[PDB]
Amino acid sequence: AYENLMLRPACPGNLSDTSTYNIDGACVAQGDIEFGSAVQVVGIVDGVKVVTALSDGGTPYGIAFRSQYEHLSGKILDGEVCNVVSHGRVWALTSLDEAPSLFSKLQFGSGGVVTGGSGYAGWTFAGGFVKHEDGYIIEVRVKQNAFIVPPP
Amino acid sequence: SALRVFPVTTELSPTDKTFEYMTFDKVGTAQIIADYTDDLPLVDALGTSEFGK
Amino acid sequence: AQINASYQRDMAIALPGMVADTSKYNIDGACVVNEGDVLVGAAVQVVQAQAVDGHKLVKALTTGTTPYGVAIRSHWQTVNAQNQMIYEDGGAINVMTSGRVWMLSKSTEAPTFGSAVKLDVDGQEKSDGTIETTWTYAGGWTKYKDIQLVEVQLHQL
Amino acid sequence: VFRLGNAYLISIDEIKAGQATGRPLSTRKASACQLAHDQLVNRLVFKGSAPHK
Amino acid sequence: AAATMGIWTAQELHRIKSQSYEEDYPVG
Numbered sequence: 001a002y003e004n005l006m007l008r009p010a011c012p013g014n015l016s017d018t019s020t021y022n023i024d025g026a027c028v029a030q031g032d033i034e035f036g037s038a039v040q041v042v043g044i045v046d047g048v049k050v051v052t053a054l055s056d057g058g059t060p061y062g063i064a065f066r067s068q069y070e071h072l073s074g075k076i077l078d079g080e081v082c083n084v085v086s087h088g089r090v091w092a093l094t095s096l097d098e099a100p101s102l103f104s105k106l107q108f109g110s111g112g113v114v115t116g117g118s119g120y121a122g123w124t125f126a127g128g129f130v131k132h133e134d135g136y137i138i139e140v141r142v143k144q145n146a147f148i149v150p151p152p
Numbered sequence: 153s154a155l156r157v158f159p160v161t162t163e164l165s166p167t168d169k170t171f172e173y174m175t176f177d178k179v180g181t182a183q184i185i186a187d188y189t190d191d192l193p194l195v196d197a198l199g200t201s202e203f204g205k
Numbered sequence: 206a207q208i209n210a211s212y213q214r215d216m217a218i219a220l221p222g223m224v225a226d227t228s229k230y231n232i233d234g235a236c237v238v239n240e241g242d243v244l245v246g247a248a249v250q251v252v253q254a255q256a257v258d259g260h261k262l263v264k265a266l267t268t269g270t271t272p273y274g275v276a277i278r279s280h281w282q283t284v285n286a287q288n289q290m291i292y293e294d295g296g297a298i299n300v301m302t303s304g305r306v307w308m309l310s311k312s313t314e315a316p317t318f319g320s321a322v323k324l325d326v327d328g329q330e331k332s333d334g335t336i337e338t339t340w341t342y343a344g345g346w347t348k349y350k351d352i353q354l355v356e357v358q359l360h361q362l
Numbered sequence: 363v364f365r366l367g368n369a370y371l372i373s374i375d376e377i378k379a380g381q382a383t384g385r386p387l388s389t390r391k392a393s394a395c396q397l398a399h400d401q402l403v404n405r406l407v408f409k410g411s412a413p414h415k
Numbered sequence: 416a417a418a419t420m421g422i423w424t425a426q427e428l429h430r431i432k433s434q435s436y437e438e439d440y441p442v443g
Contacts, residue, residue, distance in 0.1 A: 001257070009257055019231050019233070020229070020231055020303075099256060102251065102254060103271070103362055124362070126254075127254025127255065127256065127259065127261060128254075128256060128259070129256045130256070130257065141361075143361070165382070166378065167378050167379055167382040176422070197422070198419075198420045198421065198422075199419065199420070199421065199422055200417050200419045200420070201419060201424075211441070211443075212441050213404070213441045213442070213443045214439075214440050214441055215401055215405075215440070216394070216397065216398065216401070216440055224371065227369050279373075279376075280376055280379075280387065281373070281375045281376055281379060397440060397442065400442045400443070401440075401442060401443065404442060404443035407443075408443070
């Protein structure tokens with residue numbers, strides 16, 4: 001990336017390939033959510049889902065999507081409708097420096113940022129690793145019905 | 153850009169997958185000749201070709 | 206006087222590496238044959254997926270490798286050779302990573318509906334193969350002339 | 363009473379190749395589809411189907 | 416080496432017949 005290239009490779013929170021994607025449009029935000037980073041489903045009120053940034057003890061649901069009409073501030077603010085990529089292939093945010101093994105199940109922590117691989121169940125790492133600002137961007141192959149919330 | 157520092161031509165059709173160009177060589181000689189001669193040198197012409205995708 | 210006659214003949218049902226159904230399928234382009242030739246009805250392996258560019262290098266299955274997808278039959282990209290249709294080295298391959306396709310099989314008995322698919326070292330279906338896949342059978346089981354064909358359901362890896 | 367159906371696929375490159383050589387593929391596939399319909403009707407008449415009674 | 420050493424290729428002197436034969440599948 002960076003110099004010696006006419007175009008920057010990719011930007012976080014955007015789809016990479018046009019292959020069987022699904023975007024939910026009936027969602028509401030509880031706190032400030034940044035593009036990329038997994039989200040939870042706190043509850044459902046009259047059909048819509050109230051999504052929050054990932055926290056401890058919560059199963060991720062999807063990755064936030066970038067729209068240039070809904071959000072005119074560079075991030076999703078409180079009390080704003082948002083799009084969530086429930087299924088597809090999207091660029092996410094990571095706190096890594098080296099690309100993991102191919103088709104390895106990623107792990108999420110902190111505010112929905114990827115901390116490492118070598119998981120047991122969940123989404124997988126596609127082929128992609130680019131540099132962004134001060135850090136890297138990872139490509140995540142989101143699949144629906146991947147994380148099952150544990151029984152109490 | 154490579155499309156500005158190198159020449160661009162237009163010959164191939166949109167529904168082609170392969171092409172081929174040829175180059176030709178010359179083989180022969182000449183000699184100083186007197187009349188009533190039957191021994192005249194002969195010339196020829198050969199060539200090769202290459203491909204693309 | 207004479208008695209007239211009328212005859213009948215039926216077409217075949219499948220062809221190796223041919224899409225079987227119109228269900229949800231995902232065919233991935235931007236794959237390259239890194240080395241060797243790949244048959245239309247055989248599984249493939251991913252040698253390397255480039256990071257910045259995006260091309261995935263595709264080879265033929267060997268021992269102890271994870272299958273990725275099945276080659277797809279096309280009249281334009283493929284090159285006719287060995288009295289058959291194959292994908293040559295250094296050319297784009299249509300890999301189906303999801304859907305129902307007609308595979309090449311080495312088995313002799315019809316399989317069950319829902320069960321794991323086992324391949325051999327060559328990349329063709331075998332009832333007691335060694336390499337293990339996450340794909341499942343679909344039910345179809347026919348034969349084109351002297352070639353055995355089986356239908357499988359592919360799941361994204 | 364019952365209903366029947368099938369389908370077929372084709373790409374842009376194949377269409378362009380067919381229009382450039384005078385040997386289309388769409389017509390052959392459509393004829394194959396119609397032939398399959400007729401033959402399956404014949405199969406229903408002369409052999410029937412057990413699950414459909 | 417260099418085979419060729421020629422001016423015309425095999426394709427340039429070749430013909431494809433107009434007639435085309437097709438397998439026949441009777442209906443019934």
